Short mmCIF file of C-alpha atoms in Angstrom, two decimals:
data_model
loop_
_atom_site.label_atom_id
_atom_site.label_comp_id
_atom_site.label_asym_id
_atom_site.label_seq_id
_atom_site.Cartn_x
_atom_site.Cartn_y
_atom_site.Cartn_z
CA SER A 1 -72.42 53.48 39.25
CA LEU A 2 -70.81 54.79 36.09
CA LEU A 3 -67.20 53.96 35.43
CA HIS A 4 -64.12 56.07 36.07
CA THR A 5 -61.62 56.08 33.23
CA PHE A 6 -57.91 56.85 33.04
CA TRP A 7 -57.71 58.49 29.63
CA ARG A 8 -59.74 61.68 29.58
CA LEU A 9 -60.78 62.04 25.99
CA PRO A 10 -62.65 59.35 24.05
CA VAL A 11 -61.25 57.47 21.09
CA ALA A 12 -63.12 56.36 18.01
CA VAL A 13 -63.03 52.75 16.83
CA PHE A 14 -62.44 51.12 13.45
CA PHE A 15 -61.84 47.49 14.39
CA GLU A 16 -63.43 44.23 13.32
CA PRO A 17 -64.95 41.40 15.38
CA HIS A 18 -61.75 39.47 14.62
CA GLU A 19 -59.72 42.27 16.20
CA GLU A 20 -59.99 43.58 19.77
CA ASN A 21 -63.27 43.41 21.65
CA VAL A 22 -65.61 46.29 22.40
CA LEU A 23 -68.85 46.70 24.33
CA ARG A 24 -71.43 48.06 21.89
CA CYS A 25 -74.84 47.34 23.38
CA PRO A 26 -77.99 49.22 22.33
CA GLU A 27 -80.18 50.29 25.20
CA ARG A 28 -83.37 48.37 24.48
CA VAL A 29 -81.32 45.20 24.04
CA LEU A 30 -79.69 45.46 27.47
CA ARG A 31 -83.07 46.44 28.94
CA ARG A 32 -84.73 43.34 27.47
CA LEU A 33 -81.89 41.13 28.67
CA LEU A 34 -82.37 42.54 32.16
CA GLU A 35 -86.07 41.69 31.93
CA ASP A 36 -85.29 38.16 30.75
CA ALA A 37 -82.77 37.69 33.55
CA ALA A 38 -85.19 39.08 36.13
CA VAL A 39 -88.17 36.98 35.09
CA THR A 40 -86.35 33.64 34.84
CA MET A 41 -86.14 33.37 38.64
CA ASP A 42 -86.60 20.95 54.81
CA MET B 1 -32.29 43.49 -16.43
CA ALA B 2 -31.15 45.81 -19.19
CA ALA B 3 -29.76 49.04 -17.80
CA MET B 4 -31.68 52.30 -17.66
CA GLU B 5 -31.09 54.00 -20.98
CA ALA B 6 -29.30 57.31 -20.60
CA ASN B 7 -30.20 58.04 -24.24
CA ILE B 8 -34.00 58.18 -24.36
CA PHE B 9 -35.46 58.67 -27.83
CA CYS B 10 -38.93 60.17 -27.98
CA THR B 11 -40.90 59.48 -31.15
CA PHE B 12 -43.85 61.28 -32.73
CA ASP B 13 -46.92 59.88 -34.48
CA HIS B 14 -48.70 63.11 -35.41
CA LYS B 15 -48.01 64.92 -38.66
CA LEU B 16 -45.69 67.65 -37.43
CA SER B 17 -46.24 71.00 -39.06
CA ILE B 18 -43.18 73.16 -39.56
CA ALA B 19 -43.98 75.63 -36.77
CA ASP B 20 -44.31 72.70 -34.37
CA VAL B 21 -40.79 71.55 -35.18
CA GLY B 22 -39.71 75.16 -34.81
CA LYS B 23 -41.21 75.47 -31.34
CA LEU B 24 -39.75 72.08 -30.47
CA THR B 25 -36.30 73.44 -31.35
CA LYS B 26 -36.68 76.20 -28.77
CA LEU B 27 -36.77 73.79 -25.83
CA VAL B 28 -33.26 72.35 -26.13
CA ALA B 29 -31.69 71.48 -22.74
CA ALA B 30 -34.88 71.88 -20.73
CA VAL B 31 -36.54 69.66 -18.14
CA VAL B 32 -39.31 67.22 -19.04
CA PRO B 33 -40.79 64.45 -16.85
CA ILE B 34 -41.25 60.85 -17.95
CA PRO B 35 -42.28 57.83 -15.84
CA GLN B 36 -41.53 55.01 -18.24
CA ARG B 37 -37.69 55.00 -18.61
CA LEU B 38 -37.69 52.98 -21.81
CA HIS B 39 -35.53 53.58 -24.88
CA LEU B 40 -38.11 54.35 -27.58
CA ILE B 41 -40.99 55.99 -25.69
CA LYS B 42 -43.91 57.63 -27.46
CA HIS B 43 -45.12 61.21 -27.13
CA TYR B 44 -48.21 60.54 -24.99
CA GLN B 45 -46.17 59.64 -21.91
CA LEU B 46 -43.83 62.60 -22.40
CA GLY B 47 -44.68 65.70 -20.43
CA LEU B 48 -47.35 66.16 -17.81
CA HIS B 49 -50.57 66.13 -19.89
CA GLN B 50 -51.13 62.48 -18.95
CA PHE B 51 -51.91 63.59 -15.39
CA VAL B 52 -53.88 66.82 -15.86
CA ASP B 53 -57.39 66.08 -14.62
CA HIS B 54 -60.68 67.95 -14.37
CA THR B 55 -60.07 68.27 -10.62
CA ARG B 56 -57.17 70.70 -11.24
CA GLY B 57 -55.76 69.52 -7.94
CA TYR B 58 -52.41 71.28 -7.84
CA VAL B 59 -51.44 69.45 -4.67
CA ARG B 60 -52.16 66.18 -6.47
CA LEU B 61 -49.92 67.34 -9.32
CA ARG B 62 -47.14 68.17 -6.85
CA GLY B 63 -47.62 64.76 -5.27
CA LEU B 64 -47.27 62.92 -8.56
CA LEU B 65 -44.49 65.13 -9.96
CA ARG B 66 -42.02 64.07 -7.26
CA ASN B 67 -42.09 60.50 -8.61
CA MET B 68 -41.43 61.40 -12.25
CA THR B 69 -37.96 61.00 -13.73
CA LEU B 70 -36.51 64.31 -14.91
CA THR B 71 -34.47 64.42 -18.11
CA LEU B 72 -32.86 66.92 -20.48
CA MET B 73 -33.63 67.60 -24.13
CA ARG B 74 -30.87 67.19 -26.69
CA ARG B 75 -30.41 66.97 -30.48
CA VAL B 76 -33.93 67.77 -31.67
CA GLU B 77 -34.47 66.78 -35.30
CA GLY B 78 -37.11 65.19 -37.52
CA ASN B 79 -39.39 63.09 -35.28
CA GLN B 80 -36.57 62.51 -32.79
CA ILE B 81 -36.01 63.85 -29.28
CA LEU B 82 -32.88 62.49 -27.64
CA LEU B 83 -33.39 62.73 -23.89
CA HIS B 84 -30.67 62.36 -21.27
CA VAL B 85 -31.54 61.27 -17.74
CA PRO B 86 -28.61 62.87 -15.93
CA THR B 87 -26.37 61.07 -13.48
CA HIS B 88 -26.03 62.57 -10.03
CA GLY B 89 -23.20 64.98 -9.35
CA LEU B 90 -22.12 66.26 -12.75
CA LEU B 91 -23.16 69.51 -14.41
CA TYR B 92 -24.91 70.58 -17.61
CA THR B 93 -26.94 73.60 -18.61
CA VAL B 94 -30.69 73.93 -18.26
CA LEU B 95 -33.06 76.55 -19.65
CA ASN B 96 -35.90 78.41 -18.00
CA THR B 97 -39.41 78.27 -19.38
CA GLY B 98 -41.44 80.47 -17.05
CA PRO B 99 -40.84 84.14 -16.25
CA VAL B 100 -38.94 83.44 -13.03
CA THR B 101 -35.70 85.35 -12.61
CA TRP B 102 -32.87 83.44 -10.95
CA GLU B 103 -29.69 84.18 -9.02
CA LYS B 104 -26.33 82.54 -8.45
CA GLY B 105 -25.68 80.31 -5.47
CA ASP B 106 -29.30 79.44 -4.77
CA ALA B 107 -31.04 76.14 -5.43
CA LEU B 108 -33.79 75.06 -7.80
CA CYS B 109 -36.82 72.81 -7.35
CA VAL B 110 -39.33 71.25 -9.70
CA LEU B 111 -42.90 72.59 -9.73
CA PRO B 112 -46.11 72.48 -11.75
CA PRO B 113 -46.76 75.85 -13.39
CA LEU B 114 -48.68 78.81 -12.04
CA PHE B 115 -51.70 80.44 -13.72
CA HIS B 116 -51.56 77.55 -16.17
CA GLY B 117 -54.06 78.00 -18.98
CA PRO B 118 -54.87 80.44 -21.78
CA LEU B 119 -53.98 83.50 -19.65
CA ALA B 120 -50.37 83.64 -20.82
CA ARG B 121 -51.48 81.85 -24.05
CA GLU B 122 -48.98 79.01 -24.23
CA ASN B 123 -48.92 77.44 -27.69
CA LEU B 124 -46.32 74.97 -26.45
CA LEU B 125 -46.59 72.16 -29.02
CA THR B 126 -50.34 71.67 -29.29
CA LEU B 127 -51.44 68.67 -31.34
CA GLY B 128 -54.41 66.29 -31.32
CA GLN B 129 -56.01 66.61 -27.84
CA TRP B 130 -52.55 66.76 -26.26
CA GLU B 131 -50.33 69.60 -25.10
CA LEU B 132 -46.69 69.64 -24.09
CA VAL B 133 -46.72 70.56 -20.40
CA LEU B 134 -43.56 71.88 -18.80
CA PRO B 135 -42.66 71.67 -15.11
CA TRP B 136 -41.31 74.91 -13.74
CA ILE B 137 -37.74 75.12 -12.52
CA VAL B 138 -38.31 77.54 -9.65
CA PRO B 139 -35.75 78.74 -7.08
CA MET B 140 -35.67 77.93 -3.39
CA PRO B 141 -37.70 80.65 -1.56
CA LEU B 142 -40.41 80.63 -4.21
CA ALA B 143 -40.71 76.87 -3.73
CA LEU B 144 -40.87 77.49 0.01
CA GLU B 145 -43.68 80.04 -0.23
CA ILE B 146 -45.65 78.14 -2.88
CA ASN B 147 -46.12 75.28 -0.41
CA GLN B 148 -46.35 77.43 2.71
CA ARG B 149 -49.38 79.25 1.32
CA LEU B 150 -50.74 75.86 0.22
CA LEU B 151 -50.54 74.44 3.73
CA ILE B 152 -51.93 77.62 5.30
CA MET B 153 -54.90 77.59 2.91
CA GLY B 154 -55.38 73.97 3.91
CA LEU B 155 -55.26 74.61 7.65
CA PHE B 156 -57.42 77.73 7.71
CA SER B 157 -60.37 76.22 5.85
CA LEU B 158 -61.55 73.99 8.73
CA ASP B 159 -64.77 74.68 10.67
CA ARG B 160 -65.16 78.16 9.16
CA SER B 161 -67.55 79.92 6.82
CA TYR B 162 -67.27 79.85 3.05
CA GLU B 163 -67.13 83.63 2.71
CA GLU B 164 -64.04 83.49 4.93
CA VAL B 165 -62.65 80.92 2.50
CA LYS B 166 -63.41 83.08 -0.55
CA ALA B 167 -61.88 86.07 1.24
CA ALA B 168 -58.87 83.94 2.20
CA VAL B 169 -58.03 82.53 -1.24
CA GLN B 170 -57.64 86.03 -2.67
CA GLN B 171 -55.39 87.00 0.23
CA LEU B 172 -53.19 83.97 -0.41
CA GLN B 173 -53.00 83.44 -4.17
CA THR B 174 -50.66 86.29 -5.12
CA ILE B 175 -46.91 85.94 -4.68
CA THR B 176 -44.76 89.03 -5.31
CA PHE B 177 -41.48 87.10 -5.40
CA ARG B 178 -38.70 88.93 -7.28
CA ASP B 179 -40.49 91.62 -9.32
CA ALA B 180 -43.27 89.34 -10.55
CA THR B 181 -46.81 88.39 -9.53
CA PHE B 182 -47.90 84.76 -9.68
CA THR B 183 -51.26 83.11 -9.05
CA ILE B 184 -51.86 79.50 -8.03
CA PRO B 185 -54.42 77.59 -10.12
CA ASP B 186 -57.28 76.50 -7.80
CA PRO B 187 -55.91 75.53 -4.37
CA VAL B 188 -58.38 72.78 -3.48
CA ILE B 189 -58.54 70.72 -0.28
CA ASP B 190 -58.18 67.00 -0.96
CA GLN B 191 -57.12 63.92 0.98
CA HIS B 192 -53.42 64.57 0.27
CA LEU B 193 -53.60 68.03 1.79
CA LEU B 194 -55.54 66.43 4.66
CA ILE B 195 -52.81 63.91 5.44
CA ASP B 196 -50.21 66.67 5.14
CA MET B 197 -52.24 68.72 7.63
CA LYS B 198 -52.38 65.72 9.96
CA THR B 199 -48.60 65.29 9.87
CA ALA B 200 -48.06 69.02 10.40
CA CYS B 201 -50.45 69.35 13.34
CA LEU B 202 -49.13 66.23 15.05
CA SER B 203 -45.54 67.43 14.73
CA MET B 204 -46.31 70.90 16.08
CA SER B 205 -48.37 69.44 18.94
CA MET B 206 -45.46 67.21 19.87
CA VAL B 207 -43.02 70.11 19.74
CA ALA B 208 -45.40 72.18 21.86
CA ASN B 209 -45.27 69.38 24.40
CA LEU B 210 -41.52 69.15 23.88
CA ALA B 211 -40.83 72.78 24.79
CA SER B 212 -38.74 73.19 27.91
CA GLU B 213 -39.25 75.59 30.81
CA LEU B 214 -36.91 78.21 29.32
CA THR B 215 -37.43 78.30 25.56
CA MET B 216 -41.07 79.34 25.87
CA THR B 217 -40.24 82.23 28.21
CA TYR B 218 -37.18 83.49 26.32
CA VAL B 219 -39.11 86.14 24.42
CA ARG B 220 -41.18 86.75 27.57
CA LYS B 221 -38.04 87.64 29.49
CA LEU B 222 -36.39 89.35 26.52
CA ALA B 223 -39.17 91.81 25.68
CA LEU B 224 -38.85 93.77 28.95
CA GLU B 225 -35.47 95.37 28.24
CA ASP B 226 -34.92 94.89 24.50
CA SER B 227 -36.21 97.19 21.78
CA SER B 228 -35.99 96.18 18.13
CA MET B 229 -38.23 96.25 15.08
CA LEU B 230 -37.81 92.47 14.80
CA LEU B 231 -38.93 91.87 18.38
CA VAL B 232 -41.79 94.36 18.08
CA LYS B 233 -42.98 92.85 14.79
CA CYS B 234 -42.93 89.36 16.27
CA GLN B 235 -44.49 90.34 19.59
CA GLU B 236 -47.87 91.58 18.30
CA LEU B 237 -48.86 88.16 16.97
CA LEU B 238 -48.82 86.92 20.58
CA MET B 239 -51.18 87.50 23.48
CA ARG B 240 -50.52 90.01 26.25
CA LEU B 241 -50.30 87.68 29.25
CA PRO B 242 -35.86 90.21 38.28
CA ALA B 243 -36.87 86.55 38.18
CA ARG B 244 -35.14 83.19 38.52
CA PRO B 245 -34.79 80.23 36.18
CA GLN B 246 -36.64 77.29 37.66
CA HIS B 247 -34.05 74.53 37.34
CA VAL B 248 -31.09 74.56 34.99
CA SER B 249 -30.54 70.96 33.90
CA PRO B 250 -28.57 71.05 30.65
CA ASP B 251 -28.29 67.25 30.58
CA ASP B 252 -32.04 67.30 29.94
CA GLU B 253 -31.79 70.34 27.66
CA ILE B 254 -29.52 68.52 25.20
CA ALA B 255 -32.14 65.79 24.79
CA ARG B 256 -34.99 68.30 24.60
CA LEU B 257 -33.18 70.35 21.96
CA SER B 258 -32.23 67.24 19.98
CA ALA B 259 -35.77 65.90 19.82
CA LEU B 260 -36.95 69.45 19.15
CA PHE B 261 -34.60 69.55 16.17
CA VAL B 262 -36.16 66.29 14.98
CA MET B 263 -39.64 67.79 15.35
CA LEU B 264 -38.57 70.97 13.58
CA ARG B 265 -37.15 68.94 10.71
CA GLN B 266 -40.36 66.89 10.69
CA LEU B 267 -42.30 70.10 10.30
CA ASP B 268 -39.71 71.42 7.84
CA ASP B 269 -39.87 68.68 5.21
CA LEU B 270 -43.45 69.58 4.24
CA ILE B 271 -42.26 72.63 2.29
CA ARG B 272 -38.63 71.75 1.41
CA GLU B 273 -39.44 68.94 -1.01
CA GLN B 274 -36.28 68.45 -3.10
CA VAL B 275 -33.27 70.38 -4.27
CA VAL B 276 -32.96 69.26 -7.89
CA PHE B 277 -30.52 71.84 -9.29
CA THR B 278 -27.93 74.14 -7.77
CA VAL B 279 -27.45 77.06 -10.14
CA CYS B 280 -23.81 78.06 -10.62
CA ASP B 281 -23.78 80.63 -13.42
CA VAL B 282 -26.62 82.11 -15.45
CA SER B 283 -26.87 83.62 -18.88
CA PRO B 284 -27.12 87.44 -18.76
CA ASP B 285 -30.54 87.43 -20.43
CA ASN B 286 -31.41 84.62 -17.97
CA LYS B 287 -32.56 82.29 -20.74
CA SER B 288 -30.33 79.54 -19.37
CA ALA B 289 -27.95 78.67 -16.57
CA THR B 290 -25.13 76.20 -16.13
CA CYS B 291 -25.98 74.28 -12.99
CA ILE B 292 -24.90 71.21 -11.05
CA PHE B 293 -26.74 68.41 -9.13
CA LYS B 294 -28.49 67.12 -12.23
CA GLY B 295 -30.59 64.05 -11.56
CA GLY C 1 -27.12 81.29 23.55
CA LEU C 2 -30.40 80.56 25.32
CA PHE C 3 -28.83 81.43 28.69
CA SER C 4 -27.81 84.90 27.52
CA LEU C 5 -30.24 86.85 29.69
CA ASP C 6 -29.97 85.07 33.05
CA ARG C 7 -26.16 85.12 33.16
CA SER C 8 -26.15 87.16 36.39
CA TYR C 9 -26.95 84.11 38.52
CA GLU C 10 -24.38 81.52 39.55
CA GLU C 11 -26.13 78.28 38.62
CA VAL C 12 -26.35 79.64 35.07
CA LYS C 13 -22.66 80.55 35.13
CA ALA C 14 -21.68 77.06 36.28
CA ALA C 15 -23.98 75.71 33.57
CA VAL C 16 -22.12 77.81 30.98
CA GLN C 17 -18.85 76.43 32.35
CA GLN C 18 -20.32 72.95 31.97
CA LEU C 19 -21.66 73.35 28.43
CA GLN C 20 -18.66 75.26 27.12
CA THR C 21 -16.40 72.21 27.34
CA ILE C 22 -16.83 68.81 25.71
CA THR C 23 -15.12 65.46 26.15
CA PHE C 24 -14.74 63.37 22.99
CA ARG C 25 -12.40 60.65 21.71
CA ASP C 26 -9.22 61.78 23.51
CA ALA C 27 -10.41 65.38 23.18
CA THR C 28 -10.66 67.91 26.01
CA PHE C 29 -12.01 70.42 23.53
CA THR C 30 -13.57 73.74 24.55
CA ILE C 31 -15.71 76.11 22.48
CA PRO C 32 -16.00 79.91 22.77
CA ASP C 33 -19.03 81.44 24.37
CA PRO C 34 -21.40 83.20 21.93
CA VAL C 35 -21.94 86.03 24.41
CA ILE C 36 -19.17 88.56 24.95
CA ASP C 37 -19.38 91.42 27.49
CA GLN C 38 -22.92 90.48 28.70
CA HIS C 39 -24.63 91.25 25.40
CA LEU C 40 -25.56 88.87 22.61
CA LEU C 41 -24.75 89.09 18.89
CA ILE C 42 -27.53 89.48 16.34
CA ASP C 43 -27.09 86.04 14.75
CA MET C 44 -27.66 84.17 18.01
CA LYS C 45 -30.43 86.60 18.96
CA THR C 46 -32.28 85.86 15.72
CA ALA C 47 -31.73 82.13 16.26
CA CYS C 48 -33.08 82.00 19.82
CA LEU C 49 -35.87 84.43 18.91
CA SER C 50 -36.99 82.21 16.03
CA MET C 51 -36.89 79.11 18.22
CA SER C 52 -38.77 80.76 21.07
CA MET C 53 -41.33 82.08 18.61
CA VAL C 54 -42.01 78.69 17.03
CA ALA C 55 -42.25 77.11 20.49
CA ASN C 56 -44.68 79.80 21.65
CA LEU C 57 -46.83 79.60 18.52
CA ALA C 58 -46.96 75.81 18.79
CA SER C 59 -48.03 76.17 22.41
CA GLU C 60 -50.75 78.62 21.32
CA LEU C 61 -52.36 77.41 18.08
CA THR C 62 -52.22 73.65 18.16
CA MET C 63 -54.83 73.03 20.86
CA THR C 64 -57.40 74.98 18.86
CA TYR C 65 -56.43 73.28 15.60
CA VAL C 66 -56.58 69.72 16.90
CA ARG C 67 -59.82 70.51 18.76
CA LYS C 68 -61.17 71.62 15.39
CA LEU C 69 -59.69 68.47 13.87
CA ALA C 70 -61.62 66.14 16.18
CA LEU C 71 -64.89 66.88 14.35
CA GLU C 72 -63.30 65.60 11.12
CA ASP C 73 -61.26 63.03 13.02
CA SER C 74 -60.37 59.90 11.06
CA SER C 75 -57.38 58.41 12.91
CA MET C 76 -56.94 57.49 16.56
CA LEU C 77 -53.45 59.02 16.52
CA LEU C 78 -55.08 62.45 16.26
CA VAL C 79 -57.49 62.23 19.18
CA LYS C 80 -54.85 61.03 21.62
CA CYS C 81 -52.45 63.86 20.81
CA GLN C 82 -54.83 66.55 22.03
CA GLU C 83 -55.23 64.55 25.25
CA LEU C 84 -51.62 65.28 26.11
CA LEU C 85 -52.21 68.92 25.22
CA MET C 86 -55.00 69.00 27.81
CA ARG C 87 -52.59 67.24 30.18
CA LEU C 88 -49.77 69.72 29.53
CA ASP C 89 -51.97 72.80 29.99
CA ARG C 90 -52.83 71.63 33.51
CA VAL C 91 -58.85 86.60 17.38
CA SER C 92 -59.09 88.05 13.86
CA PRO C 93 -58.71 85.58 10.96
CA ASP C 94 -56.10 87.65 9.13
CA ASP C 95 -54.14 87.77 12.38
CA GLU C 96 -54.45 83.98 12.52
CA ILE C 97 -53.06 83.72 8.98
CA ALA C 98 -50.31 86.10 10.09
CA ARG C 99 -49.55 83.83 13.05
CA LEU C 100 -49.31 80.74 10.85
CA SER C 101 -47.17 82.62 8.33
CA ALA C 102 -44.81 83.87 11.04
CA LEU C 103 -44.56 80.32 12.37
CA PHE C 104 -43.46 79.12 8.96
CA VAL C 105 -41.06 82.07 8.68
CA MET C 106 -39.41 81.08 11.97
CA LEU C 107 -39.34 77.51 10.66
CA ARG C 108 -37.61 78.66 7.47
CA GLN C 109 -35.10 80.72 9.46
CA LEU C 110 -33.90 77.63 11.34
CA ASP C 111 -32.99 75.13 8.58
CA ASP C 112 -29.43 76.47 8.73
CA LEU C 113 -29.24 74.99 12.25
CA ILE C 114 -31.57 71.99 12.45
CA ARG C 115 -29.98 70.04 9.60
CA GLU C 116 -26.63 69.63 7.91
CA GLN C 117 -25.39 67.56 4.99
CA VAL C 118 -22.64 65.00 5.36
CA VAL C 119 -19.91 66.02 2.95
CA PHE C 120 -17.20 63.38 3.24
CA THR C 121 -17.05 59.88 4.60
CA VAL C 122 -13.72 58.25 5.32
CA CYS C 123 -12.52 55.31 3.30
CA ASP C 124 -9.06 55.21 4.87
CA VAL C 125 -7.17 57.27 7.42
CA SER C 126 -3.44 57.76 7.03
CA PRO C 127 -1.30 56.77 10.03
CA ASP C 128 -0.57 59.57 12.54
CA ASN C 129 -4.09 60.84 11.64
CA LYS C 130 -2.84 63.91 9.76
CA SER C 131 -4.69 63.02 6.56
CA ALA C 132 -7.39 60.66 5.40
CA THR C 133 -8.87 59.44 2.13
CA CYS C 134 -12.54 60.26 1.66
CA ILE C 135 -15.10 59.89 -1.06
CA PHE C 136 -17.15 62.96 -1.78
CA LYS C 137 -20.86 63.14 -1.04
CA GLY C 138 -22.63 66.35 -2.04
#
């Protein structure tokens, strides 16, 4: 299920979209995308 | 480019009363800071009153004072102050301004003054919303302690109550160095003290990681058989809790001690800012001292 | 000087025999040992005591201070340094001020060892290496 990370303690971020990528997904957004992916499916 | 003028003339635009010229004649061969390094500077840039703010951030004043060019007063006369930015290595006399007694053989550093205000009632050339501010020429251990207490008052004031802070400033504002009591004007936490704290804590974390298997247990093995007031006085600031050394590998210990010296120097340079004068011989009333290392 | 207490063993004695000598540029030079007659002089004792004290106080305080610093964290260099403290590991306030002050005292009592000023640098060396011509740097 949940991931298993190497570095123990978390690190804050300060970067831009033009710098390195980061997954920042709010929960209702990923929920709604799961609904939209579920409902779109001799 | 024209060369940096070793003969800096300061001018005056205010109507100088006669007592002001008299008090200006007291300060011959003293230290004054100036950032401009021109030949015919005005009086506004002279001194330190251009940088005194409502914040009264003494750490900010120490941060800016290190960048200011120090010179010596000479040949005071009518509306003329001949200043001499001294070349490095030679010797000429300076004069004290604050009540700080000196020695021979020690070193001197530049510093903004302590309890600065109307408490000692300095009428040091007051004219037209401007005062002549003098940096203190303080000796070496006073300059050590006056930044050590600064950094400790920075580090203690995190995540703690304000009554602890108000009980901690009064425990760490007095300095009883050499038969005199000094007080620091408003030690206030700012971003400069924050970045100094960051450098200090990173260096001491790295040297805590850098400690070998033997140097952390040296006092732990020593305090079983030794008895001394030094060892007793240093033991009680530690927690409570023959044998063999684990593995002697001096080829690793040379590298550990070398990088530990680098980390100790990296902690050290937060309080050892600059030697600016080495005092050779003083006057007996201590009003002046012939010293070297000028510049 | 740090091996002054465990001199009774033989690995430490061979280590003292190793560290006491030094090879350099055509130099088989040897130093004297700071210990004489299995007891240490007060200068070296103060030196090793100050170094062991600053190492012990760094190993004690810094975890608490950087853990307090993570609430007001503003640089990623600061959060990753306490991670290695957690990796390595696997009170009255006036006493805390006393601990910090004693740390800085042991730091001040070590500047005579941790740094030194270059005095001369050689412009020219005379042949047969007996003398040389140096500018001063003080």
